[PDB]
């Protein structure tokens, strides 16, 4: 008999969005740890890990370690109609086969309740190739989102070069050739924060880069980790309550 | 002969929207009382009745009861171009076969004039239902619009359950099952008012409540009236110079 | 060598949009007097002339008069991505065959470089039509723009009529008939400025007037010159650094 009440429904909304863009169904591992979603796309090139630490909710209950699959496509539909600044309780009951969403006014005068059938989804299998180590770059999430969305006019293959205090995005297509340089501002105190062990230059699929970048709604900064010849990682982190990561394979030559 | 000129054309633009949702030609009864439209949708389930009273216009001249058939499609198209803050004169001459919309700039520097051919429309049939209403809820027009656009994600029939302190809007369907609930106590003399004759519960095509709920461009509040086994009424008041009133058959067996 | 950096990219962005809606490829003559584009629509009925005087750029080098033909589709695409308020520099090296675009932050913090392949476009026939007569009218660009879009709900041919008093745009079609009238009697002494010799009433292909009107993003005002049985002209002066000028064939039975 799980329960998970976040305070501003806007979060769930911005999440399911990001994630729906990559898989249309997925399992919600509910542990008293918190909620997590792990999943791959249909072409098995990209990974989603999302954590919501139990201390992220304003209520919580997971004595059990239950799993709930559901339709993201449908959750996305129900979530679009849910006011941004309403509260939102996820809920289950033993073998119910139905999860139930519950929105309430701040002023406690509007109450909505939505109920989705669940699935019925198979074991995750592949997950968590780790750990990149070699180079880290951090930057403006929405800056980043733009840069991908931008490169896409050229090819659907971005190339990321990590230089001494440099991160360079190139692409090629029929149109021609673009790039974008970002020098590293550093380092304190109260811009781009490269931190390489290496000049390393991998490249990636833009379709998928794009899917990821939708994350910029959850976090102002975004972190990119690389390892020559390994699944790279893009991490959007909630400040005190969890993270969203994507891993994606390089192109090989 | 008929001249009828409103100050700000926004009002016309907004109204033809409301009603072009239900029917695409209507007869306008023009009489010295003012303009009135009364129309029924092709399936005979929903009736519109709109009245702009004579004083809604900055000036109004209607010797005799003439009837003009107008293609709401075309009208709507022409109103889309007329500016919100311009004035609009609707005029028709003795045996003119056409009606003419003239619009002027507040500063009289610009003058637009549009002529619409006018149709002959088979007489709009069944008459206004009434009257005794067990119940009467009155909530925010814009809220109500959201509620019916919301319910539409589920299925296309909305059940409206009326309680004291409550009115429940429920759906069902392939995506699942929602309900939005609005409560009604306090506070005189300072939400959602309700009225005690009985607990009553009817349901209705969402297709049509949708068409209705565009009424929220005309009035901050909408009023719902209901009676057992009878056509509900949704009335939006136009600034105390007319009303837009809709009626829909329950989806009873 | 050639090198032409404008201060705010906005200009090129709004510019390519204008001409891109007339031809999808065209020639960029760059002489030391400035940049010029002459272009004819495929249907050989209408004409773009566009100049930007050398004083218009923050840096401008053009010792000899080289031509660059290039794809307006691609160019439009690249400039959608470029920030309005970034600098943007245009370069071509001896016979390079590729032009390079270079955007930069005001604060030199992000740098972008795009490269496009150029082409050979064949010279488009007839120079520009010379003789102009005493019909003129100058209005708000944006009001002009609205009027075409407006007149287009009726037909596909606007009829422009210059009188001492004002200019009359009219149009007919399925929907009905419509006109817009504007006047210019006096300013006396602090929008419309007619200055004709004789009354003159031509008509025109709305499709193109639409295309032309996009110019309104360039200049707050717009001048239309006419001449009995001749191609009219629409001029959008850039603010003393250039002009965008369109020529269209009248339509006579």
Q: Verify cis geometry, omega within 30 degrees of 0, for the bond prior to C189.
A: yes
Tokens of A205: 């699929």
Q: Verify cis geometry, omega within 30 degrees of 0, for the bond prior to B182.
A: no
By Cβ distance, the residue of A150, A177, A183 closest to C81 is: A150
Distance CA A122, CA A95 (A): 17
- Cβ–Cβ below 8 Å for C150 and B115: no
Phi-psi category of B242—alpha, beta or left, where left has phi over 0 and alpha has psi -120 to 50? left
Distance CA C34, CA C216 (A): 22
For residue C174, what is the nearest residue in chain B, using CA coordinates?
B74
Distance CA A42, CA A72 (A): 14
Would you give the DSSP letter of residue A128?
-
Q: Which chains touch C (3 or more CB pairs under 8 A)?
A: A, B
Let me know: does B216 contact B13? Beta carbons within 8 Å: no
Give the Cα-Cα-Cα angle C200, C204, C206 (nearest 5 degrees).
140
Of the CA atoms within 13 Å of residue A72, those in its CB half-sphere come to 21
Q: Give the best residue of C166, C176, C192, C193 to mutate against chain B (max B CB count within 10 A).
A: C176
- Collapse the DSSP code of C240 into the 3-class scheme (helix H, G, I; strand E, B; otherwise coil) and give the result: coil
User: What kind and span of H or E run contains A101?
Assistant: strand A98-104
User: What kind and span of H or E run contains C68?
Assistant: strand C67-71
Tokens of B74: 């075309």
Distance CA A150, CA C230 (A): 44
Distance CA C224, CA B48 (A): 47
CA dist C211 to B64, B234, C17, C156, Å? Answer: 47, 45, 10, 13
Let me know: does B67 contact B29? Beta carbons within 8 Å: yes
Let me know: does C51 contact C38? Beta carbons within 8 Å: no
Let me know: does B97 contact B117? Beta carbons within 8 Å: yes
By Cβ distance, the residue of C175, C178, C183 closest to B109 is: C183
- Cβ–Cβ below 8 Å for A153 and C81: yes
- Cβ–Cβ below 8 Å for A176 and C98: yes
Return the CATH fold of A1-253.
Answer: Proliferating Cell Nuclear Antigen (3.70.10)
For residue C110, what is the nearest residue in chain A, using CA coordinates?
A182
Q: Resolution, in Å, please?
A: 3.2
Q: Verify cis geometry, omega within 30 degrees of 0, for the bond prior to A189.
A: yes
Of the CA atoms within 13 Å of residue C33, those in its CB half-sphere come to 5
Tokens of B33: 């009382």
Give every CB contact of residue A195 below 8 A, 6+ residues apart in sequence: A135, A136, A137, A138
CA dist A57 to A53, A89, C57, Å? Answer: 8, 9, 56
- Cβ–Cβ below 8 Å for B114 and C183: no
- Collapse the DSSP code of A209 into the 3-class scheme (helix H, G, I; strand E, B; otherwise coil) and give the result: helix
Distance CA A214, CA A210 (A): 7
B231 and A CB contact within 8 Å: no
């Amino acid at each position: 008999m799980l329960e998970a009440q976040v305070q501003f429904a806007s979060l769930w909304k911005r999440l399911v969005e990001c994630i729906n863009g990559l898989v249309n169904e997925a399992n919600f591992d509910c542990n008293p740890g918190g909620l997590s979603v792990q999943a791959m796309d249909s072409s098995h090139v990209a990974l989603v890990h999302m954590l919501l630490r139990d201390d992220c909710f304003v209520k919580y209950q997971c004595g059990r370690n239950s799993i709930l699959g559901l339709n993201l496509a449908s959750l996305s539909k129900v979530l679009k109609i849910v006011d941004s600044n309403d509260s939102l309780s996820l809920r289950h009951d033993d073998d119910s086969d139905v999860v139930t969403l519950t929105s309430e006014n701040p002023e406690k005068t509007r109450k909505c309740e939505y109920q989705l059938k669940l699935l019925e989804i198979e074991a995750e299998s592949m997950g968590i190739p780790e750990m990149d180590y070699r180079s880290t770059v951090t930057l403006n999430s929405a800056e980043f989102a733009k840069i991908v969305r931008d490169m896409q006019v050229f090819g659907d293959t971005v190339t990321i070069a990590i230089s001494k205090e440099g991160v360079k995005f190139s692409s090629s297509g029929d149109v021609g050739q673009g790039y974008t340089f970002l020098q590293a501002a550093g380092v304190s105190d109260r811009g781009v924060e490269v931190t390489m062990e290496e000049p390393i230059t991998l490249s990636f699929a833009l379709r998928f880069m794009g899917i990821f970048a939708k994350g910029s709604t959850l976090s102002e900064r975004v972190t990119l980790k690389f390892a020559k010849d390994s699944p790279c990682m893009v991490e959007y982190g909630i400040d005190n309550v969890g993270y969203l990561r994507y891993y994606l394979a390089p192109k090989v030559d």
